[PDB]
Design a protein that fits this description.
- The structure is a homodimer.
- With about 140 residues, chain A is mainly α.
- Chain A has one domain: Winged helix-like DNA-binding domain superfamily/Winged helix DNA-binding domain (Arc Repressor Mutant, subunit A).
- Chain A has 7 helices and 3 strands.
- The first copy, chain A, starts with a helix and ends with a helix.
- The PDB classes it as transcription.
- The entry lists the keywords transcriptional regulator, transcription, Structural Genomics.
- The assembly is dimeric.
């Protein structure tokens, strides 16, 4: 009732919620040699798209400290291509490779599998969506 | 139907709410030279508790990869200490120091400030709480 108690409950429940979700993603993704964050990046890059490391970090809310080594990892696995620009070799363009393009869409099956494990009704899921949408406004 | 649709919305919204939340905690934690994960570890350890890096890792959903460096960093700040119980020295315990249990007092003020920023009603907050409590409870 006090905002102190509600805030501690919100803190706890958002933390555990997101961590339980991520743990399930990590389990499904391990056989793809992917982390949850690597998954998020591949899904965020739109297939015919070329984009800057800074624009990608904004879309996905990661700083260059995290993205940079992640991209090299993805580049090693041949899911992303990191092409240095002609004039400024510092500046990098990021795009999906052919297999990076392909493994999206088996990866697109994973979200259904993760959330079905929580066994909530469509109604409960719609309530959570409406809760969180209003929350993110 | 709607399972594919609903799962994408849920994924997105849990991802973005977590980023928005952590961003606000990070702001308030600058003062204290603590990372968000640092804050979470300090609050998770009850003032007079001893526990394994395994068990602490369970609680805060962190593996040794990430916890090991975190603990040594908190230990050099003098907030935590690592000890082995004489009954079984194989068990490496972690517990809070005196000044590690101390500054948990001003840190405990942060959560109210963070969630106040979203400007939701007590009814909305209570409903979020009830819905997430239902979600988490089946693990």
């Amino acid at each position: 009732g006090s905002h102190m108690y509600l805030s501690k409950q919100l803190e706890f429940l958002f933390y555990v919620s997101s961590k339980e979700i991520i743990k399930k993603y990590t389990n499904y993704l391990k056989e793809y040699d992917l982390t949850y964050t690597g998954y998020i990046v591949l899904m965020a890059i739109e297939n015919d798209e070329k984009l800057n490391i800074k624009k990608l970090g904004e879309r996905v809310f990661l700083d260059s400290g995290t993205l940079t080594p992640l991209l090299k990892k993805l580049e090693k696995k041949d899911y992303v291509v990191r092409t240095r620009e002609e004039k400024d070799e510092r500046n990098l363009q990021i795009s999906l490779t052919e297999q990076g393009k392909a493994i999206k869409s088996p990866l697109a099956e994973i979200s259904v599998k993760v959330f079905n494990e929580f066994n909530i009704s469509e109604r409960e899921a719609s309530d959570i969506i409406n809760n969180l949408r209003n929350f993110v406004s």
